[PDB]
Every structure is written in C-alpha cells, then in structure tokens.
Amino acid sequence: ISQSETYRRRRQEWEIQRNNAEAELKQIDAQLKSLAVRREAAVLQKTS
C-alpha cells in the first residue's frame, strides 16, 4: 500500500505540473490573440 500510494502521490504532483503547463498553453493563445488585435490596430495606423 505505501508503495502504491507513493506512486499515486507522484502522479498527483505530475498532474499539477501538467496542468500548470496546460494553463500556459491557453493563456499564450489568448496573448497571441491580443497581439493579433494589436497588429491590426497598427495596420490601421498605417492606413491613417
């Protein structure tokens, strides 16, 4: 049991760390999207 639980706890630590990476992978897209908007605003500045 303690060996099995050791592996379960290790898994939980891995789950949190993959979840942290997962969040970064979603926040970054939101950042790419705000950048895309920023780029379009800059394109309009060129139009001006």
């Binding site: 939101a30 999207k33 705000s34 908007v37 920023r38 379009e40 605003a41 309009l44 500045q45 139009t47 001006s48």
Partner: protein, 48 residues
C-alpha cells in the same frame, strides 16, 4: 483698376475659402480612421 484690385481680392478670398473647406473635410476623414483605431484598442483590452 479698382475693379481689377477688387477682383483680385475676390479671387484670393475665393481660393482661401475653398482651402478651409478642404481642410475641414480632410480632418473629418482622419477622425473616422482614428475612431476605427480606438475601437481596435478597446478590443485589444478585451483580449487582455
């Protein structure tokens, strides 16, 4: 020669009027572009 001077003054004044109208029309166009730019700025903040 008095009609001559009068006419010249009318002509120069006529052209000055045309220019002021031109400049105000041009200002309106730049404002419209700036409004589009500001809308993108607002969208950028929503993206953030």
């Amino acid at each position: 020669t008095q009609f001559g001077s009068t006419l010249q003054n009318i002509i120069e004044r006529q052209d000055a009027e045309a220019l002021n109208a031109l400049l105000q029309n041009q200002a309106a166009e730049l404002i419209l572009t700036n409004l589009s730019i500001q809308d993108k700025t607002i969208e950028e903040l929503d993206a953030e």
